[PDB]
């Protein structure tokens, strides 16, 4: 029998040894480990494809890790999906799976656990800041000191604000919780009501006035292609996680902060991801793989050698910082407690409404970027697509 475990680490070491570490530990499970082998499948392209096509003709691949992206709302429908909380309750991994236990809980149900926690604030260039005499990120108490920054910004040239696209639902989620109201809206699924609710079309609408006078040449792209610019020093601000540190310690100039009004993104996301549908010992193999990727040396490893936040509460991220030498590991623990010691605190829309809502959003927010689109009736469009779906 053969366990096929996808994953997205397909990286040479060379375009990011992260990767590598990464496919280091699983082929270490597969040399530990009977009568099941671990196959581990490193996916090139959209992870979501490889799960999508499984749950159209009623199957799920037998592990996956989702990365962040939220489990299908119809596998879990069709429970194609194993309910994992039972496995973790049961052998104590309460601490192990950390923000997962409680957030990824769907009526006392865990369908996934992300061993690298969705804890992201934002990445600014301190010297194009101080060049645009912009209030850097620690001095946002309002969305219009961030706008005014930008603004700022955008006189001096060589340089644009910010990557627009993906990490534009980044200033959408925290700007939402930037009241009781829009906070509430993202505890849970959301709802025709939610959608248009006052709080909901405000922060809708002062994103995308901020997209467009980022301009239409700069929404064209994800988080992963912004990145090279912002290290570059092409870019002045980078909305991305802590995870990013690796690449971000490289260039000294650039710095964590969090979004106006001291809102930090802390969510779990969608991780390992286990079929309902396998014999009795490759389910078991499965749950012992999350086992694995949860534990305490592991995750150390998770926090050392890849430079992201673990799920795994026992890893003293604080102590570990404290006592390295490493500049990835420095600003990593810096960017953390950044996050921790916010003012509030949201999930991923991804995580909480799921993954089609979160798309949609990702979509109109790049559309509006566009010059010759109405912002009022941009807004008025957009929640009517969300209602629809
Ligand atoms: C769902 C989502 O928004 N994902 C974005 C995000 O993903 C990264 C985080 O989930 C991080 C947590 O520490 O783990 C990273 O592995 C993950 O990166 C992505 O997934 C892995 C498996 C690889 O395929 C990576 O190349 C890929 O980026 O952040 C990235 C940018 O850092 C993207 O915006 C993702 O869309």
């Not at 992201?120 to 850097?136: P, Q, R």
């Not at 340089?159 to 990490?167: K, L, M, N």
């Not at 930090?264 to 996301?269: C, F, H, V």
């Amino acid at each position: 029998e053969v366990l096929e475990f996808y994953h997205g680490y397909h990286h040479s070491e060379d375009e990011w040894p992260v990767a590598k570490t990464m496919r280091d530990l699983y082929d270490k499970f597969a040399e530990e480990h009977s009568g099941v082998e671990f196959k581990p499948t490193p996916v090139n392209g959209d992870l979501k494809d490889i799960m999508n096509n499984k749950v159209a003709s009623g199957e799920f691949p037998d592990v996956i890790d989702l990365a962040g992206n939220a489990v299908s709302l119809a596998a879990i429908e069709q429970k194609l999906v194993l309910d994992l909380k039972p496995y973790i309750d049961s052998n104590k991994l309460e601490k192990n799976v950390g923000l997962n236990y409680k957030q990824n809980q769907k009526d006392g149900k865990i369908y996934t656990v992300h061993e690298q926690l969705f804890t992201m604030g934002l990445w600014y260039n301190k010297d194009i800041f101080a060049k645009a005499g912009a209030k850097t990120p620690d001095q946002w108490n309002t969305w219009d000191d961030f706008t005014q920054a930008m603004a700022s910004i955008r006189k001096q040239d060589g340089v644009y604000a910010f990557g627009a696209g993906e990490p534009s639902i980044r200033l959408f989620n925290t700007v939402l919780g930037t009241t009781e109201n829009g906070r509430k809206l993202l505890d849970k699924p959301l709802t025709k009501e939610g959608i248009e609710s006052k709080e909901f079309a405000d922060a809708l609408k002062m994103v995308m006035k901020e997209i467009q006078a980022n301009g239409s040449k700069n929404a064209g792209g994800d988080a992963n292609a912004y990145s090279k610019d912002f290290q570059e020093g092409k870019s002045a601000v980078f909305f991305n996680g802590v995870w990013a540190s690796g690449e971000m310690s490289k260039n000294p100039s650039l710095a964590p902060g969090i979004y106006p009004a001291g809102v930090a993104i802390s969510s779990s996301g969608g991780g390992i991801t286990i079929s309902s549908k396998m014999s009795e010992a490759k389910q078991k193999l499965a749950l012992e793989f999350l086992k694995y990727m949860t534990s305490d040396d592991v995750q150390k490893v998770i926090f050392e050698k890849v430079g992201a936040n673990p799920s795994n509460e026992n890893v003293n991220v604080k102590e570990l910082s404290e006592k390295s030498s490493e500049a990835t590991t420095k600003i990593l623990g810096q960017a953390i407690t950044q996050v921790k010691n916010a003012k509030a605190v949201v999930p991923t829309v991804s995580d909480v409404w799921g993954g089609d809502v979160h798309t949609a959003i990702i979509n109109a927010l790049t559309e509006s970027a566009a010059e010759n689109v109405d912002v009022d009736q941009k807004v008025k469009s957009t929640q009517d697509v969300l209602k629809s779906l």
